[PDB]
Amino acid sequence: RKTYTLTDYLKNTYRLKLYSLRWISDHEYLYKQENNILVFNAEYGNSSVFLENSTFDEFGHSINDYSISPDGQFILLEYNYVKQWRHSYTASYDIYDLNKRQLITEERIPNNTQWVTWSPVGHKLAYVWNNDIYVKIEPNLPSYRITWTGKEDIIYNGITDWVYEEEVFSAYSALWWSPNGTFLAYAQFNDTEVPLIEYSFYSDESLQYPKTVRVPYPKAGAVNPTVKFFVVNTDSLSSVTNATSIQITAPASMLIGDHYLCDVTWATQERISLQWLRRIQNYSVMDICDYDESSGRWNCLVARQHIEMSTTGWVGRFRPSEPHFTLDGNSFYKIISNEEGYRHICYFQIDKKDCTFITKGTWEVIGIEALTSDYLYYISNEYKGMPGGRNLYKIQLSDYTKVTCLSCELNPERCQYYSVSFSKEAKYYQLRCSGPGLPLYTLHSSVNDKGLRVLEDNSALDKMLQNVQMPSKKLDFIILNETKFWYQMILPPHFDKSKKYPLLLDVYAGPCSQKADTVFRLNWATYLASTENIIVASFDGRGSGYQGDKIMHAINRRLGTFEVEDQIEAARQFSKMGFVDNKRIAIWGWSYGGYVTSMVLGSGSGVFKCGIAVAPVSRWEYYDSVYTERYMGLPTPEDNLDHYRNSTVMSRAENFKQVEYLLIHGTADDNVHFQQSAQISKALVDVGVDFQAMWYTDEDHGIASSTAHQHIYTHMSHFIKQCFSLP
Amino acid sequence: RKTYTLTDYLKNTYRLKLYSLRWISDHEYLYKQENNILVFNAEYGNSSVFLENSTFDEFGHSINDYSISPDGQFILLEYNYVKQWRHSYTASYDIYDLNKRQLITEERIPNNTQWVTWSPVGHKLAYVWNNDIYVKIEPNLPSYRITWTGKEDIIYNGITDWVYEEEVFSAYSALWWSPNGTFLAYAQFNDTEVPLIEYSFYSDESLQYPKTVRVPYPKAGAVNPTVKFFVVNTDSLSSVTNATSIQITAPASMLIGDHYLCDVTWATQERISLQWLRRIQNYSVMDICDYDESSGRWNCLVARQHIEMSTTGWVGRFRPSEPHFTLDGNSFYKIISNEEGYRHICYFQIDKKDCTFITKGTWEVIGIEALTSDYLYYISNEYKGMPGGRNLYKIQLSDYTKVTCLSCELNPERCQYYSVSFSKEAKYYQLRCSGPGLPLYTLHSSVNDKGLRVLEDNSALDKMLQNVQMPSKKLDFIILNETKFWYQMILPPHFDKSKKYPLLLDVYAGPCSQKADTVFRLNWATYLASTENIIVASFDGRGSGYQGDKIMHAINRRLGTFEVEDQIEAARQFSKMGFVDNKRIAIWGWSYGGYVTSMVLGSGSGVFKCGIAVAPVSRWEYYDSVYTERYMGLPTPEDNLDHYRNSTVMSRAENFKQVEYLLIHGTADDNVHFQQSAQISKALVDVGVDFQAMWYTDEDHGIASSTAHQHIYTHMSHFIKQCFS
Ligand SMILES: N[C@@H](CCNC(=O)N1CCn2c(ccc2C(F)(F)F)C1)Cc1cc(F)c(F)cc1F
Numbered sequence A: 001r002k003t004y005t006l007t008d009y010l011k012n013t014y015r016l017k018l019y020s021l022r023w024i025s026d027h028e029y030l031y032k033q034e035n036n037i038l039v040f041n042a043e044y045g046n047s048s049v050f051l052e053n054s055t056f057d058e059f060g061h062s063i064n065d066y067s068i069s070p071d072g073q074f075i076l077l078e079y080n081y082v083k084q085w086r087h088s089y090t091a092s093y094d095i096y097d098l099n100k101r102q103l104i105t106e107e108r109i110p111n112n113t114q115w116v117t118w119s120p121v122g123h124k125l126a127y128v129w130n131n132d133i134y135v136k137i138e139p140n141l142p143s144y145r146i147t148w149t150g151k152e153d154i155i156y157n158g159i160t161d162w163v164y165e166e167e168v169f170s171a172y173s174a175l176w177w178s179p180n181g182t183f184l185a186y187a188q189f190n191d192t193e194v195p196l197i198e199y200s201f202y203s204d205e206s207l208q209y210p211k212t213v214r215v216p217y218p219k220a221g222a223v224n225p226t227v228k229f230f231v232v233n234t235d236s237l238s239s240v241t242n243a244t245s246i247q248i249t250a251p252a253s254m255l256i257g258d259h260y261l262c263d264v265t266w267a268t269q270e271r272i273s274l275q276w277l278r279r280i281q282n283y284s285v286m287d288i289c290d291y292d293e294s295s296g297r298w299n300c301l302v303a304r305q306h307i308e309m310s311t312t313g314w315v316g317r318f319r320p321s322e323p324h325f326t327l328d329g330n331s332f333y334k335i336i337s338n339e340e341g342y343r344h345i346c347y348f349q350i351d352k353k354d355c356t357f358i359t360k361g362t363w364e365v366i367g368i369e370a371l372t373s374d375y376l377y378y379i380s381n382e383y384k385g386m387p388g389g390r391n392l393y394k395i396q397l398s399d400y401t402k403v404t405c406l407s408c409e410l411n412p413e414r415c416q417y418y419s420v421s422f423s424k425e426a427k428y429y430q431l432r433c434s435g436p437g438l439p440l441y442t443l444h445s446s447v448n449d450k451g452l453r454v455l456e457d458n459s460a461l462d463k464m465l466q467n468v469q470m471p472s473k474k475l476d477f478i479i480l481n482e483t484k485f486w487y488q489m490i491l492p493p494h495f496d497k498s499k500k501y502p503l504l505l506d507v508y509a510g511p512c513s514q515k516a517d518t519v520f521r522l523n524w525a526t527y528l529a530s531t532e533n534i535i536v537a538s539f540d541g542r543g544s545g546y547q548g549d550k551i552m553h554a555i556n557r558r559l560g561t562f563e564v565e566d567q568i569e570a571a572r573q574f575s576k577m578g579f580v581d582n583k584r585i586a587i588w589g590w591s592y593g594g595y596v597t598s599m600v601l602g603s604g605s606g607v608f609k610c611g612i613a614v615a616p617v618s619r620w621e622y623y624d625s626v627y628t629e630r631y632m633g634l635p636t637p638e639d640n641l642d643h644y645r646n647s648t649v650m651s652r653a654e655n656f657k658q659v660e661y662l663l664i665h666g667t668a669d670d671n672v673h674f675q676q677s678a679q680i681s682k683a684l685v686d687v688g689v690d691f692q693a694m695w696y697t698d699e700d701h702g703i704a705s706s707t708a709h710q711h712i713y714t715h716m717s718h719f720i721k722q723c724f725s726l727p
Numbered sequence B: 001r002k003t004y005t006l007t008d009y010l011k012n013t014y015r016l017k018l019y020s021l022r023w024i025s026d027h028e029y030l031y032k033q034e035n036n037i038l039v040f041n042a043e044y045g046n047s048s049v050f051l052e053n054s055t056f057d058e059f060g061h062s063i064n065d066y067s068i069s070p071d072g073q074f075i076l077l078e079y080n081y082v083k084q085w086r087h088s089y090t091a092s093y094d095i096y097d098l099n100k101r102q103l104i105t106e107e108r109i110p111n112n113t114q115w116v117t118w119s120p121v122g123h124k125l126a127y128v129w130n131n132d133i134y135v136k137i138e139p140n141l142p143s144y145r146i147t148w149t150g151k152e153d154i155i156y157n158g159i160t161d162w163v164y165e166e167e168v169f170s171a172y173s174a175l176w177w178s179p180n181g182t183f184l185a186y187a188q189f190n191d192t193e194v195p196l197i198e199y200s201f202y203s204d205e206s207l208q209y210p211k212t213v214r215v216p217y218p219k220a221g222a223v224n225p226t227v228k229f230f231v232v233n234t235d236s237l238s239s240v241t242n243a244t245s246i247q248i249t250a251p252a253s254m255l256i257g258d259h260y261l262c263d264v265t266w267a268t269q270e271r272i273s274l275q276w277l278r279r280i281q282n283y284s285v286m287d288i289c290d291y292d293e294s295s296g297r298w299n300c301l302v303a304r305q306h307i308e309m310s311t312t313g314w315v316g317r318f319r320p321s322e323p324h325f326t327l328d329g330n331s332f333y334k335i336i337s338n339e340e341g342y343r344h345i346c347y348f349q350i351d352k353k354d355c356t357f358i359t360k361g362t363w364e365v366i367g368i369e370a371l372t373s374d375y376l377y378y379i380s381n382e383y384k385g386m387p388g389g390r391n392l393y394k395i396q397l398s399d400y401t402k403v404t405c406l407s408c409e410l411n412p413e414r415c416q417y418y419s420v421s422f423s424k425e426a427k428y429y430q431l432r433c434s435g436p437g438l439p440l441y442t443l444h445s446s447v448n449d450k451g452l453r454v455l456e457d458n459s460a461l462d463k464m465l466q467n468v469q470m471p472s473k474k475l476d477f478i479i480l481n482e483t484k485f486w487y488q489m490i491l492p493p494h495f496d497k498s499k500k501y502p503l504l505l506d507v508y509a510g511p512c513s514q515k516a517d518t519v520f521r522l523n524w525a526t527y528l529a530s531t532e533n534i535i536v537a538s539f540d541g542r543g544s545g546y547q548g549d550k551i552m553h554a555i556n557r558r559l560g561t562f563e564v565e566d567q568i569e570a571a572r573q574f575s576k577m578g579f580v581d582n583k584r585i586a587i588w589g590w591s592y593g594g595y596v597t598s599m600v601l602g603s604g605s606g607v608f609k610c611g612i613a614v615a616p617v618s619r620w621e622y623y624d625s626v627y628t629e630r631y632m633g634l635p636t637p638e639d640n641l642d643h644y645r646n647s648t649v650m651s652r653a654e655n656f657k658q659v660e661y662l663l664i665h666g667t668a669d670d671n672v673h674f675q676q677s678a679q680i681s682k683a684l685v686d687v688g689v690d691f692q693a694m695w696y697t698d699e700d701h702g703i704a705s706s707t708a709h710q711h712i713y714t715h716m717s718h719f720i721k722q723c724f725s
């Protein structure tokens, strides 16, 4: 019978079904079926039509995305989507009235709008255009221009610059609505002295002269952007006077040097939490700012400040976690690393510096999902002591020793990886299963925890996969220096433990990474095991996350050392298991993985025959400040220049004579610039090392465009096949 | 015994010996031996020492180049050479006194100087710095700044901009000395509205942010640079008044539209020849400008203008040829294409429009080398009717039917390719042989044409090569449509005509190209034949030069058509000869050849298995105006846009599924921009064609840096070997 071919992955023959819902009330959500936006009731189960598929056939545009106002009165329509960076994009927007049946022609949202968002209650609109903020109380009324200083590539109002979008906020939006819709908090970013990265873009063959793309990009040690935080009142907006934005300044302990705004979370209607981080990211300060109703100013009390610091590494996983405030807003829950280095929920009092841990163990809390007056819902990797697993737990606020796992025993064989979506005030929740079996989407009630109905069970895919020879997934660990280190193997169908298989080491190994988990995936690895009979192994060594600060902080100020060595060591241990042809061991990676892959191939360990590095880092001085400095500090002789110069791929150029090497990079990569790969290629050419190259015209860090995605995975398979000697 | 390996080519194991000399007088030249600059007398044969090797041991710098003043008084010393483009470079210069023994410390020539040149007589210095011209009568005296308008990337005084350096003058210098040293003729280039080409340069690993390189570069149909010509008097230079440069303007027939200054040749002490060319390069006009001694102005007479035009193509081979004036300066000799399309010497009279051809036939004159009152010396491909041959001929000025070949019979088996260097007033000449045998350098006298002595015979190399199994070279023709088309083959040692060999088609095929000649070469082809037993074949199809305008002008307004088809057709004829394994035919090329290689592999002819394209053109709108427009006209719907859009490599993307393709490009290529290759790779990725890629960080159109040159040829050999199994 059939096997999982390359075309099955590239043309996406066997699709995983998802269930994408948005809660609007405490018992109602929305799902679109056959382009018909329906509203599903959780109480009874009866589904009503909210918007029919033929409503926008005469709209004249292909609707890219939609956003419905929380009061169910208006529907924002995104079209003409032009992707910028990872999360950022410019588009055109039209507002449609749901109360009537008319498209609003008056005072329309301008073309090339950067970001648009509704207020949490009602139908107020805040949008960023030309780096400036505009507010609209009614969808047909004129817009109140809040900011005036917005300038392209220089000043950013309501939106993040490149470095804040990618490395800090993980989004384009730098606007924050108050729970009522009274205040619009926003950040301002000044990129005046931030250096530009410049690269060519070639566009269509029609374009005669290549366009140079300039982006404000702070590399390691370079001049960072400055940030200012403002809050404006959306109600008292004069049609004859420019709106007054009250600036909140950072603490004096932060104003000493360079800093970042790394969190904005509203507590109540007049209480806002802010978190600041020093450029050397081992010190963090939280502010709790109240609104002085008489003066109209914002006051953050020094007796309300909370400090987060570490001497073993950086603060947070990638940044300090978000606080979760109780209804009154006098106390917040937050994930902090405890004295033993494990990340658990600490219960804070607004005025008291010391917090009380409500959870503890040799495991970690992933995220706080929902908070009621009775329960706090969180996800953790506690169940069976497996870091690669995710489960929903509930904790009693009146009794911290009463912990109930709501997902652990639902389908123990099929489901070990959970993420959850809660309704307003956490009345009903959707549990989404993602592995090791096929994805399972179920709806549940919080009141008595009964499984009401199965939303999606992927039985349609299950029927298809019975006809195909699928690979098996093994998740186990090995003991090194009295420590458990988890690995995962994609083993070929009919895996014979007595035979010798070729092994490909799938690599990321970044700070706080997890390549070994229980997730069910249909990727390139699936093809290589099912068709080419190759074991695709992944290993979480030192520096990987969800295992405590002892493991995660091991690679602190030492990027390109332990995490690189552990991947080599893992390969030795796999061949010692006896089913690995140690004459055919390969290694591949993307992004950070490409860097480790490159570092490994140049270590001279002789363990690996060949390797593929796709869009790799080659030198930490080439990558952005926020990321690099978080782990490596500053590249100055006074700080950590020694480890910066010692961790380059270029210095390990000679050892590449031992290996077959394929370097791949997109020419329009804004994230990891072609420069990185260009320095590697040059280094190898200098010492007479032969290698393989492949550039991708006008491709970014994802090489994600349909035709390029297919071409790269085709080209890589060909490289792997010839390295392993496969017809 | 041993074979010619890859390392023999890459490490240059077997070196060809050269003999590089510069004439200073009518009977004296200079050669440097063991770093000792000697002066060799042609009259007696006795060599004298001019400058010893230890003279500049305490100089403190590695001497990059030297230039000696004509009067033998001073020696210019180039150091700190920083290459810019093909011919252009910035350097530092010191002047050393030969009369005394002292380095001049007063009024030194500034650092980062673009170009420096002596006057033809004496020791006057003209140098270009920051795009401005400076004159120095004495090496120790202050400098007279002629131009003041010089601005980087905008205004060019005394130096050519990118497009003029590469495509027009074939040099960086835009300065022209008068025979005495009285006048300094110079050109000014305005690049104000010329568009910029922008690419990244990565430099050392230390450089944190890549530098963007901006170059004024006019692509096909884009805004061209404007040109202004000036002449200044070098004698009447006031130390208190800015020098007056007299502007010479172009004819009214040229000022109607865009034009180029394409030639500057001095006739006498007060007579200068200029040649102008329309943007549509099928019309040319020459001016003869005299100096009005009373007014101080320059006057070019309307009754002295000579017109060159063609309706079958472009004027000249790459540009209109240079005139060769007689001693009095009332008549000049020039190579013109005759009525049958063959390029021969036409004798012009300053006032008379019609010229008289002194040579004719089914062959072409290559270049006029020297002119005396008795003889004109020229090189032509006449001997035995071989276009790939070069021979020195002399013609009697009193009798045009009296032609003598001075080189034809010297060593007929060893020597068929000659270039010549003449002394002042052509009293003695050096003949340099370059093939098919080993290079032979001989000194001769013009008076009675006896071979005085052998300068270099490469017998040292001959001894080495007897121990090595060398490939043989065959130069023959094939007849297509009643026309001879010459090809050349690098055949493996002990070539068995009954066996089947793999064939690599070495391609250029550009307008006025010649890949088939008698030259002896030790290249990559030598390795592939000697070690890998591969026939490396080259074929001169339509559009190739030195065979008449019928052949050369065939690809007019049709680039990427006939010349591409003829390379495919040539491969058929080679396999028809029966010693070619038609299952293993490859094709490779550089520059224009890379474009043809790419076009061929995308023709779907199925003749070729694999191919390598190194720094190729992909679309003619991407390459510069002067070159592209010379052959293709303007890329406008009114002109020739149809042929522009039809000749792209991108449109032939689908057919690449049939072939293995290796695309190579240097990232810092100013000539053929990485854009060209980037558009190919994208096009193939779009239609799902798998290929092979290889970029080269901070490499130009030559990929000539030591480590990169070795790496590319290693990488290409590996690709060829696996394609041929
Ligand atoms: N830009 C970084 C981003 C790191 N990941 C990251 O910010 N997130 C992934 C998961 N995550 C995030 C915040 C909190 C988490 C979680 F807690 F781990 F889940 C966002 C990744 C990256 C690393 C390189 F080394 C590189 F070269 C490029 C590159 F994009």
Ligand SMILES: N[C@@H](CCNC(=O)N1CCn2c(ccc2C(F)(F)F)C1)Cc1cc(F)c(F)cc1F
Residues within 6 Å of the ligand: B166, B167, B170, B317, B318, B319, B510, B512, B591, B592, B616, B617, B623, B627, B671, B672, B701
């Ligand atoms: N720019 C061209 C230059 C071609 N050669 C050239 O102009 N000369 C060499 C021979 N020559 C010249 C004038 C007269 C002659 C001669 F008569 F052929 F000898 C100048 C080379 C080139 C062509 C391409 F198609 C391309 F893409 C890049 C490139 F550099």
